[PDB]
Amino acid sequence: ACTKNAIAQTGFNKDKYFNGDVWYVTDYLDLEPDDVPKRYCAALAAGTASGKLKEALYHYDPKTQDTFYDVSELQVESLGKYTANFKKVDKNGNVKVAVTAGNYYTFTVMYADDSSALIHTCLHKGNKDLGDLYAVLNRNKDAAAGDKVKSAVSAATLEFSKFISTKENNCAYDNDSLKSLLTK
Numbered sequence: 001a002c003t004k005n006a007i008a009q010t011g012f013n014k015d016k017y018f019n020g021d022v023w024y025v026t027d028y029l030d031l032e033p034d035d036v037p038k039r040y041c042a043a044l045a046a047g048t049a050s051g052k053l054k055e056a057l058y059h060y061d062p063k064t065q066d067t068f069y070d071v072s073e074l075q076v077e078s079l080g081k082y083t084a085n086f087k088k089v090d091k092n093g094n095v096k097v098a099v100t101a102g103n104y105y106t107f108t109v110m111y112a113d114d115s116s117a118l119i120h121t122c123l124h125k126g127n128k129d130l131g132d133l134y135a136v137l138n139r140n141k142d143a144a145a146g147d148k149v150k151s152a153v154s155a156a157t158l159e160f161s162k163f164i165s166t167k168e169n170n171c172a173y174d175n176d177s178l179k180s181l182l183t184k
């Protein structure tokens with residue numbers, strides 16, 4: 001179960017964040033740690049497509065090779081805080097699992113600049129019991145977290161030392177698919 005009402009960044013710049021480009025997860029913290037594998041990789045694209053606010057997600061377990069993409073149109077709750085009903089798709093946007101009520105995530109941008117971000121998400125997927133997930137993002141998949149984003153982690157009353165890095169997993173991303181999926 002999720003327990004946090006994450007606070008969005010003061011002054012969040014939506015057009016910069018949702019610019020159509022890719023964000024890579026470099027580090028994550030699940031407050032129910034035993035909810036997600038210790039070795040993982042994930043990335044997303046975020047942008048407006050034909051007037052609609054969109055995200056495209058990619059998940060890859062580097063040990064099991066379990067792979068999936070998602071696309072969602074984000075609904076606005078407040079600036080920097082969204083609710084996203086997702087559909088599982090292949091890399092070309094063909095639907096594998098349609099949108100349905102009860103399959104959604106919340107998404108809060110706690111901090112962002114041009115290169116880095118800190119987000120919170122709470123996933124709801126049917127009857128699974130999932131907890132709060134924080135992720136440090138960067139535009140560069142290999143970037144070490146800098147002081148702006150690590151300070152933001154502190155300001156959220158979190159300890160960056162507890163985050164798990166995704167960097168040592170050889171993950172390789174299909175950026176082209178993530179960008180194109182924004183339209184799907």
Ligand code: HEM
Nearest residue numbers: 025028036037040042044059070086087088105121123135
């Ligand atoms: C930007 C950040 C992330 C968002 C918005 C996000 C969103 C989601 C969504 C929507 C699903 C369900 C997909 C579907 O069934 O179609 C999912 C599943 C999953 N995510 Fe994430 N995720 C993110 C980061 C991560 C990270 C960093 C991990 C780390 C370990 C992770 C682990 C998982 C796992 C293991 C599942 C499969 C749940 C299951 O069905 O059993 N996610 N995520």
